[model samples]
Target chain A: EIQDSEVDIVIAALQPNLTTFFEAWRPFFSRFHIIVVKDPDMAEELQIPTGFDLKVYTKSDMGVLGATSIDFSGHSCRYFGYLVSRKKYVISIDDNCLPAKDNGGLTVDAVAQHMSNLKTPATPFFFNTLYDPFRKGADFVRGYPFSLREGVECMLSCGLWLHNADYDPMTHVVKRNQRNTTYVDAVMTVPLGAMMPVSGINVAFNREVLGPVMFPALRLRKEGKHRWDTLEDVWNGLCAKVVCDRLRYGVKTGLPYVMRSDAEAGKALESLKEWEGVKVMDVVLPFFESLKLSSTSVTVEDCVKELTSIVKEKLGPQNAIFAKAADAMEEWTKLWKSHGAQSA
Target chain B: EIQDSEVDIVIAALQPNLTTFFEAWRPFFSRFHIIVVKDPDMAEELQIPTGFDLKVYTKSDMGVLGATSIDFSGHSCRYFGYLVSRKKYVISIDDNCLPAKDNGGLTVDAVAQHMSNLKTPATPFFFNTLYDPFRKGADFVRGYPFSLREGVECMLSCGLWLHNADYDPMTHVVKRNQRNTTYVDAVMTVPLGAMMPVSGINVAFNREVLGPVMFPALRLRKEGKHRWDTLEDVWNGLCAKVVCDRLRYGVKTGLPYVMRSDAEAGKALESLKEWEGVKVMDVVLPFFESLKLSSTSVTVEDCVKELTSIVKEKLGPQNAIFAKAADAMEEWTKLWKSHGAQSA
Candidate 1:
């Protein structure tokens, strides 16, 4: 493990597939050896391949039942026993999902070196598939198709780059496809046309997305429903986009970074440009960093206050007052339903 | 062929599965057979048991895609093609599915006899299963679970009941769940606990459900997500439940009208009663149906008059008059983006 004072690569896995998994992703993994688990079957299979450099163990070798992606969904958490360890840089690619050429041909070392060069250690680069343009009349058919641009907010999921990522289903539960919000980058290689329309696919995460708790301890079928593409992912994404974008350490899609597939890159830019309201954390990240604000120290109140001020200055005092009131009510409502307690 | 002036049965199938399928469902089928060219591959996989007492032909033999259920969807006049070709008492069932208990005891003859006595051509009964609760929850969870109750109105994809039903992906069309609006006896036998998280399991169309146009002209996705659940069945259930007391149609254990294993019955009911606010559609159907009514129809003068009345009622005369002027601007604002040219 190359442990620099700035970044750390941690390895955690299950038992079965590790033997042959390395061969699949070894070439693209040139830059940084990052962390190698040697075992490929350990990472849980939640549909999205966790990504390159992680070892996975099929549950069979661990004397456990299969780790279904939809575990604990209908009041059955037979797969919650995992997540005993932790890591700073947790790469969650699965063994079966081969890496052809997505990551700029940068090895784990290259990626890590790039991260180390970042002005802030907390700022993480989310590598994901960009959105695609709506076909003709798609916006007329569905409002979400070509309208509704979000700044600093989006629907982020699957195949994540986490700075100390969370691995529990309960605490870091994801809700299927939800409205985009700030904090998370709802990135994916697939288009909106392909998602199952309920649970999302190929989600990734970090510890900050999980908030105060490492995992949601209060287990329920409803809580479990927010996996991969349910409510959980939305809530987390909202926290980051809304809260972190207000501070610093916001999300940045690797869309404009460069790509092997020019077709996909074109789709990403077209779709991104079409979303008028999407909160581009990438745009705001440098802006906030320039101001010396970071996610670790910034508070939610700070965000609401900033947005409140913006509304007030632009729309007049009455509108500003109303916006603040609405933000308060919204926060209260989320707290009431999600935790059954007031927010800090 | 008992074609009394009172009723008509449209039994639809891919000719082959009708025998064993009819044997199990015959107890409930009274006067309908809307046969469609059931996919030959699907028919073969059904594996109807011996002595099923039905016959089917390939498309080449019949000279068409076997009689298509499209006839029943109101899109085609051929809906009654099968009834005209065969007996009046029509029954539709797949070769794979059948009644569990008294396989011989529960036959279409029994249903036809019962329906004739009632003088109603259309009736619906539950097909018994090994795990009634499993089917029930599966029905409900896939239909409307708690996590999704808020977005019920924004249904993107109809559940698995798409076949033998209708769907319109273009318009996001789906026949809604049954809402019991009236009172009736002769409730169909249902697998227990099946009603929770309501689903469009089996819709029995006497006349109103099918309407004068007969089957609804629904968009079929021969190779997409919309085809998975049939909207016809969904609409049928909603129509039946709406016209009758949903509870009355609900199948209780040991009810002579219904036939299901004790375990199945227990599971269905248990699952149904397990959650609050998540009651069986039978119980909530009427409430929803009652609320579905509209006070006024659409017309230019009527709409203006209603808007004037609402403004007058809510905002006093002076404000109402001013608001009427304001509404012109608001309407313009709404139109400016899309139809800006003419309005401008």
Candidate 2:
């Protein structure tokens, strides 16, 4: 077993299915500001945590709160809409990325202690998939966690991201610095280290160090497309590379929600003659991990990396590429031979 | 004739149509960048101009150059795409806004000069009509050029608008420099004067001053009966008021083109034994001023103004409005002249 005494897991997501995001991070609500944006109008439309001190803004209020939608000038309006407080560490998690299984057994205070010692602003962790879309065997990459990637990453639109007040605000908008052509490149130039507090897709940050950095627009609308480009992930990836001062992209290893496929799950249930061990549907989720096309242009290398990660987890690490006979043989032996190789 | 230029006259629209937009503006091409955007691909696009060189950017190149197109983003995208030129002065004209009597005498060079000097962006100078698809005046308001109340003036959508890039980049984005709290409030704060610049329907501007500002994505995509709200004019009007410091607006006035119902120029044509003196059919040039709804949007006011200045030798000031009075009276006398009276 790997020693993991010093790791705190937190949760975050936008307009997520409330039950799951809430239950997973419920304990840490005191330590974490569970933000539920009901639009800038503080509209009555959203279902949010009851009794929590709520701060809401309409789109305009969002602008005043430091959130801006793109305007006619083709430039993003700046915004400051966030509920942030000073804390040495914090984390972010998508409604789907974080599951109850990961934090169910642990206490919030205890988890916080374990997370405080890692001297890196970024790190990786593992969790099982709730649903294996690829239909591969192993279905989980073991030694990977979230970390920022190196390079320029800036975009216009809005989506998922993690930030607090500690990081310099100068990095968020080129209008202020005027040096960097884009905002993502500007923030990556800041200093940070592992355990230094990077955001998880479920992430956290050091409020004292990174204050609140406004998330620039993510989806850029073209002249004719009715939809905006989804660049939130790429953007966060960019910002982390800047302020964190290192290369670690945000990730999760084996998220605990059971991997489910209605057809396959039903078939498996049939084979088992009961709904004993597996769940056909994730009550709180299944939606979050529902994979869709990346929706943006990605390079072949990135494609290869993603495919290989899938191949390694489902088939076997030795078959990471599945190119050579020897590698396949080694993987086959590990999975199919003597004791439980085939099952394994 | 009255002093060389002091006198101005307005005559009923000449039955024998005189000149087309191309014919009138042809002579002025050398004076400004004679941008003839054709359906076919001509050249690469750029946000900034390289030199005195005339550049042509087609629909495809527009994406790379940050220009938009209907094929990609819908009709509104054309606005941003058109606005992206680095030129300080950009003249906008639709194919239909032909001139009166220049009749092959003028050239593209002259049109360029007029576009450059007038400082007209979004000017409704063209001969236009709020066509009734139902073949009655009733559909006019609901269809093209809807009506506007006394205090209500909408920034127009189509036609022509020039861009001046020298002004503030965010002129038309937020609420301009005056006041900005909510996006909508800022959008509506535009002064009626801003409409004075060429109507957004038919405008021209200094690209350096006006191209950068844009509208919020939500407004451009609101689902409703009339999508006029998504039009470029409403958005441009907001930009002129919010960004630029009181930029003026106006439309060229004169004899607007007309649609011949009886296929004759006037009542006299049908009665005349010979179709000799200026029969409406005589005005039908192969491509220039054929039977079309291109002239209806022009009110008596626009015709009086444009003809007085451009065709001063023929109709001195006293006769200009009166000469066109018969046709103007046709529309003016109507109780509910929604489309004609409400033009931008």
Candidate 3:
């Protein structure tokens, strides 16, 4: 069990059932400063389950930070929690990410593993693709670089998911009729200099290392009539990696595979459309690849500023969404320093 | 049998094994203008295989083209051949990349596939990783981006290799005694924007699409006491992809799986060191990632000149070897324009 002094647990949930999540993860709740971010419209319906040091926030609560108008309603809460988190480490997770039973009760060990690896003093940046190399075709964790995997360090270390396994939307569509049969286990590590896309789900970070490029604001885009709801984490991860690269930090992926519930494949077509937003990575990555950020005394503010500049230069100045996103980020940094200090 | 007007097959070989390669690939050579390049030192031992309109050149023949001093001795011949090739399509290969029997009696269909795909009018720039995806994890073709595999295009379309299966030195060290078992088959395409690293083993290109970045001279590097003997293909592929990206081309991997002779694991340490040069991609990739090249009227000379300028600007002018490589490229372009006319 984790003590309150160790880590803060942050989650962004759209689902109404909070009891099922908390009941399943009761052992570590006592020590965890749990923050749940939910939709503003659901505030009245969202029941705060009793018996945990928990704080629930809605988009209305984010108004003070000037983040309410952002189009990515799903991830606004994650950004809010990142700004207010004061612990040595923060474990950001999705509502669907649950603890695996195979690993001896659902504990905060996955978070602890990342905290330990982060402080181990090898490289500054770390992520886990959390993939099983022995499993079929290097079933790579999302965002892990295949080119650098062998000589470079890239593997999952955190924990494995229970059900859906971070399989993208296409996988869901292809195997929609089939059931997930992943034998969750402790993933090993390959320590090399690389980057993987770290999602809000089941990720622990050293606040100091991750604070500089925590999640950024992004505008939603329409694919035909469907809105692309993915890439929020990808944009954040790319920005963080670019900043980390300048700082000479080794970003790793793998370990403590966090189990996930089966994806609600009800809208497989919509889901595929959302997942296709991964193409945004093509543009975002190349932009960051050539970008050079200042290394000496880089603060969280500097990282956001660099990200804004990149958005303008690469995506074009006409991209008002990113322009607005840049504004939201500026507001976020200021809010973090001001009210965030009091919250801590 | 192919008419003599379609494609030219170019090879850079050190071993005197022309008969074995040709006897296996008789039909494709009829329409192919065969050009074999060897080291100046091997000219004496080289034999001209009959039954084809074959032309063989030594490094001495490339004297006016100024390709004699590049550190990647093997690939210098490839650059020389590229300069002289005037066919509609250029099939660049290594001596060891024999035709795979599984693919219709070892025809150049793999090369034809790339040429057809390049001219298919989908997207512009195309590169095949030329790996057998059905092969085990250890048989990874370098530069094959595993992240973009499904819903993305990456698989072996070319014929399979016999022994080594493109196994790197690290694979040799880890599973030294394991026999490579790869059954190559059909490769599909996914429409997405991505880049994969290409090698000189077995790759084909539309002469027009490939002409701009036909492999350029690369300066060798020191790996401990030994000078790194590779990276010509990687640099060429990177430059080509960058130019292709600007030209709005889709770079694909998987096809034309060329077989490799078993790696002598006796020097696993040296092989591992050689394999480690892949890290250079880490640096080279990002430099090209941020680069923006003009698409209107780009010439092969422009591409090489841009690569040289990129090396000096990104890696610093103190990296003088690339500067010399750039100068050698200028000479090659001039020679190709003048003397290469008659060879065509």
Candidate 4:
């Protein structure tokens, strides 16, 4: 069992009341300290359950970070939870998510699985034909270089969901009833040179290693309210994956699914204007594919610093908004450094 | 345990006496029927154990298959064993090989592992980070499509060596003391579009699916006697892999290691001449990389027939010898079809 003090459960909430959210996850998350980051747009008095180690950061608390153009509202506010987290591991989940049930109908201990994913080594260099080589009954595959048997330290673990999976706004409008039912009981390293759609929903990361890049900044357009827009985490995921590849850290996705109950995206259960909206992903992937960090950028902070510079230099030419995103990334790194020094 | 009648242990031997080889493998091979194919150059009387259900084919048996320029001497003779094998599976091992012991000193069961590999599904599309998904404690990784979950049928199982690994002549001369001591206890499917150096030594395959392309051809130069020359299996492997990918079959490598006792390659603890000896692989790999089977090629025979045609068209211009190799491949497929009918 993981110590409650070692893991911090972070949540970005738009709803004033979180009693339902906390109650749903109480079986699996009762042991941990919860850090709630309220959306800046919300002025209502947030209500959370009592009798748990809890801290809620609101719009007033955002003043501590000083003047920054970055919006710490809606889903993006979850990054602040990671920034303020004092534990070794930070597990962030959407407020709508509940403890998931496995195919056998048992409640999935998502934290335990995420911790297991974090503790094990990740085979980033070579594919382990089984998946989760460190798990019992699985091992390094043959011809996997003996030199790489001792794999890279796993830094990030992205969990999947059963219902209402994290999808773009356009995806929901097209296939509103598309619910993820297939429970694939496996965890695998996102192989080096490749990147995954790192959803901030139901995801965890080692705070000490991956904290600096968790900032939500890539807002191509005004983030539509309570909607899946301005995919900051997806863009951050692209940045973090390149850093992982350069820094030799393993990023894994899969296992420990959480059940999402939100039905808001289905309101539009609709099609053509939405179709024309999801075009940035086409060019964004190739641009990130071209993104690489130099050998000089060794540490996470250094890598993030260099990555932001490159993003500003290259992507800024097309989307001038990326220039602001780059600036926001630099501010977060500076805040991270200052915060660490203040506690020291 | 796999039934003895269902599997044939094929051995290509030049030594008149195989008492030591038979004795070493008696514990495992005693149950199975052994099929030994003697090289054409070996005029000496062949000998084997009386207790085992065994049969030896010699240069005279080669008459059944009409006259062809393809040589049936040395390592190349092993293909004849696959051709004549009546069992569902053929396990071919080099005569110099003995049952290998693991790091724990227990004798390795090469056949059992090979059989296990053959029985399971091979995840060719998505990398299973653990290796061998069907084995206990491992399952398909996340992001591995549910459609590709069933996986392609495994056709070939290529095992490795302990003391003297299957290395190129140039690789051996560079580091004489180099030996494979690091034993990775796992098996992996050669992912589609990727080719492996499939050595004839200590290899097994489903005789029904892969028999056609196992012909020893691709003789770039006059194959030196009792030497690792011609690299017919290497070329055949390239042909078979493209066929595997095209036919949606899986080819696995690793596990169930055999100890190679012979030290003949180290006669010259031996430079540039050896370096100069291995150059064809440089161009051969890229040529195969560019190789893709059209949709018209469906079955294994169809794929092989189409593959030989491409090899003749593309490679014949470069090394006129490839044209002969292509001809030999066609002949082997024709013989395979005829032999299957005759046995029926």
Candidate 5:
């Protein structure tokens, strides 16, 4: 009846003090333990709110890694929280986001809704227009096959955001007054074969199931930390989707929207100049389009390796960065398993 | 390069004259041949415009429809137009809809778009976030399988409306000012396993492929003729979606939107009582959920027969009207082929 103790709300904190941020989320987060991963590049010691069961991982935690330390810089440090948490489910939210207010000003319990989405099976092979039919008020709409209605095991749950959506820099340029005012009260599965720009801003996933592949592999640090500069999370989601398609898992998106941090555009136009989402999506999408996974890539680990190997060999030839991206992906898998063993 | 002459624009009209409607849509409709099915109960003779390749089938036409004539009163008469049309494609629009205007006020050439939708294969297996991947300027978003990208044979294309979105009597009660202001300029295929309410207002389809299964079988004519009183088109769509799923075809929605007829729910509130869409949807949805067409139902004709037989055998027991609905469905298939042979 309640969200069990085995859930961790992972916060990617860039600021030394998350007092205001933690205060806004206390209503929802009070029930669950918190895992704060301070940005590795930040020099200040963390100042988390008192009266809470929480753990803050700073730059010092990186010392514990073996000979090959996984690069945990910027928001990519959120993956460290994933590795450390011994929980059934992980709900990751960017520090910029606050508890979302719905149409009636109801503070949306992003964590609770995420948990609801995680526990349910996802219908990946089909699309339900009215939202997740399995939700309490909804039912499998007419024409949905009864055979497939049981649905596949859900592995990921990505929530949406009100106020400022996680729009890329280019999107902000074209649609200047873009404020995502509509909060469609529904959770839909990002069906098996389709790929989505999986935003880490307000998203949740089964920690154990997705631990190894959920890494920030594709980094464009040299391009500048314009946020859009690195399509690392986007790349990781793409990798996870291909593996899910081949390996038979499900990913659900929408619902449990949190109010996004208010900010945008002069920055977007400036960020657009620095980032290569244009060229990257161009290359990345087609590679995934042409990508295929065989029966031999059975386990999650095996499948990710094959995907990266193909990226290394194929996309690497197109651009040297993709090959580097592939190498980081493999290392991430390696690191996740090395420390991931402690929890399992 | 263009829409072939083998296309028929089916119009269901209660009005005696379509002068104003035809005048409004001349830009789009001028290219194609038109088929106007006058309501069976309309004592007034049907009136159509001049300077158009057209056919007007009235109550007199029903006499030739064998010993047992189809009940072609109200909008259900549109199905009659489908049976009579000898075209590769059928684009059905209610007399009330006008040519849709884009943001820049350019009239949407619905006929060309419908033809485009018909000729293209629909990706029913996956959800493409952007419009149809087959359309120019849009491609399958990330994670869509290259193997399945070729897509299935699209059987139907349902277009939306601008001024008055098709509101059920109940929907009008909840949302009064619900004028469909936003037009999402995208067309998506209803994934193979899901069902949709195939609105007869503004839609297109491969006539030959979907003709037999397009009959409005679930008629609540006994309940006063509140347009919402009948779940016939809704039932027809549900039936077609199931057959499409079983037969490996596809149905698409959300493009080539037309400006809908300006109407209201004082009418809707009055109509709500006579209609058991509340109970009908309750019964019909569950029936379709339990309904499955097997391998023996190989061809389209075979599939329709199997589905109707189940409807008669199962849903008919629950309500005697469903048995009647099944009988009408069988008759429609028989009538379609009897005359449909003339074209094929």
Candidate 6:
């Protein structure tokens, strides 16, 4: 195992199933410093394993980083995981996300190498499936843009699943079982310009540059009520892309195929509001394209600030919702800068 | 107007958006009786239009047929709408599903012609995007069998969405706002044998032969709790297909390209359980394939009984939950037959 002193692994812990993910990815156990964020209430109820060099934290632990105001009770672990991460590179994953293996196990170095290579020169990226049903010569990936159906470069780097690909839970319900096997593997990538929607499940980040922007904002509905949870990444992704454009960094997607468990098809009533945040980009995409930011003194805060203005404008009367998210981003930036200033 | 007395429109009404569907398809407004199934609570708050020969009902209305035990709060309206349907062909849809139109409107006669042409000699069909991602020239539609990916005939005739295809709320979230001007129209179909997962939103059934199999069973979790919802049609679709095989009626999917509103992406917590009913089909598929019915005089009740035994065996300790659904189907079948035998 290759030991990388500057790398750390962070996860927001859920329940009995979280250990299974850690178990599946055991080869990387001793290679990196592992940090797990657990609920203050469920900390006693959880049965955690003892193999790895693991560090655990609760809501009270987040008070040091000014994150005590944020609710990590449910899916807000993505934010907590980032806040506590102190390594040069932080590999964040969900409890349900597992490593895709071939004949033998893949090491932290092997997985991190794919993400490790993407550094300072690295750009904002949204990497997921590039499948599109509307165009010819393009394999169908969920979330592929219909506007670019005539044939785009991004469609080439389509992502596939190992077990139950990133299929909508409803799709899994209809098929009755998982379709793909761990054997059928296909993960590709283009040079640039691919805008695959970024899922928070398995993503890595560079702490210095992309650190402040890593905050997963709260998602809202069309009516401005607090809607679905766990989509903080998609919104963060768009904001990152806008920031990346200003920094002249090119976003890349595909590579390092991540296997995910079949997600729960929760109550259909709430399922309706699940994508409210991602849909905001539909109106914001044009504004993002028209943006002309210089690469001088660029920071995640600048990106958040600029995007907030446009998001506020497009949202019209729904500006207050965006304003709430901007406040969270401001706190996140302060916490991130303080962490970065600390010596290793 | 070419009025077909044998056809009728049925819908599970939810919100005010239901009226937009009626307004969009107003050309066929006076052609057939429109049936709306609303919630008992929402019945008072709903402002129903008066243009068409419309009939409205609630959960109380379903009680005369012993369906009060089932929840009509969500998608149970599909079954209730079917139970009260007096026409020979009941085109059941969600209030949000609109007719895909091009130059001129496709009348009830135009839409029904595609479904009406499907007669006693029908096979189990699933219609959706035919763009196969697997083969050289084939498009694999969602839920296409992994074993049959080696160029199945079903992948030939795939489905396409005209405006906002994949309007699943997540699509809306990603796009920010709804896309598609409706000018980009392309709906196609071929002969038969595509087993796309059926949605209650836009499905047509011959109330005579397929009527007995229209019961949407309750879905359960592994621990015996009520899991996901909105999969009544998928379960019903598979059951209908199995019954169709025994009766020798080929199922056909595709055509009458149903335009759906971008669904709401609600709370992700409940979204996890939405596919629980469908996931049960993984074991059910093999059981369905192994059945040996010798063109017997079998009713839907018989199909449900035989299927239930195998389902109980496959589900093992989860058998109690399957038994609950079996009981619901039994009630549904009884109510359907009683309605069939009654004078119009």
lDDT of each: 0.27, 0.25, 0.51, 0.72, 0.73, 0.49
Distance (Å) between predicted and true CA of A143, model 1? 22
True contacts kept of each: 0.00, 0.00, 0.00, 0.00, 0.05, 0.00
lDDT of 1 by residue, A125-145 (tens): 110111111111111111111
List residue ranges in candidate 2 displaced over 4 A: A1-20, A40-44, A51-60, A65-88, A95-98, A102-200, A208-214, A221-229, A246-344, B1-344
Each candidate: how many clashes?
A: 112, 182, 44, 8, 4, 54
DockQ of each: 0.01, 0.00, 0.04, 0.05, 0.10, 0.01
Q: Comparing candidate 3 with candidate 6, which one achieves the higher lDDT? A: 3
TM-score of each: 0.25, 0.22, 0.55, 0.58, 0.65, 0.41
Candidate 5 global CA lDDT score: 0.73
How far in Å is the alpha carbon of B90 misplaced in model 6? 45
Docking band of candidate 4: incorrect
Candidate 5: which stretches are off by over 4 Å? A43-45, A66-70, A222-226, A342-344, B1-77, B83-344
Candidate 3 structure quality by residue, lDDT tens digits, A1-344: 23447677777666667777777666655567887877543444565578888887777776756555454355555666766666656776666666655433445455566654454333221122212233322222212234444432221223334455444455456655543333323233322223344544566665655564565565445321111255555556556656655554444444555566655447656757555444544544455445666665365456667666666566655456566666666665565566554312
Give the least accurate 10-residue stretch of model 1 chain B, judged by summed lDDT: B151-160
Model 6 over residues B159-246: C-alpha lDDT tens digits? 2233444332233344454454332222222112212344455566666667766775654432211112344555676566566655
Considering the true interface contacts (CA pairs under 8 Å between chains A and B), give the fraction that model 1 also has.
0.00
lDDT of 5 by residue, A1-344 (tens): 12567688888877678888999899888877888888877778677777777887877776677525246778688888888888878888988788988755788988889888878888876555434767644544333434566778888888777766665666556766756665555577776666666767778887777887887766765433335556777777887888787877988877888887766437777767776556666667667768866678888888877777888888887876677767778787877777764444
| Residue-level error in angstroms, candidate 4, position B302 | 22
TM-score of 5: 0.65
DockQ of 3: 0.04
* Best candidate according to lDDT: 5
Q: Please state the error at residue B171 of candidate 1 in Å.
A: 23
Q: For candidate 4, write residues B234-289 as lDDT tens digits.
A: 77777787788787788887677898875664443332233322455555755776
Q: What is the lDDT of residue A34 in candidate 3?
A: 87
Name the 10 consecutive residues with the lowest summed lDDT in model 2 chain A. A180-189
Between prediction 2 and prediction 6, the one with superior DockQ is: 6
Q: Which candidate wins on TM-score? A: 5
- Worst 10 contiguous positions by lDDT, candidate 5 chain A: A137-146
Write down the worst ten-residue block by lDDT for model 5 chain B: B136-145
lDDT of 4 by residue, A1-344 (tens): 24556999888897788898888788777788889888888888778888777898988888788747777767778878787777788888888788899766899999888988888888876555445767653444322334456788998898877776665555456554666665666677776766556766778887877788887677655543433554677777777888888999998877878997766534543322342235555556557657767899888878988888887788777665677888888888888887732222
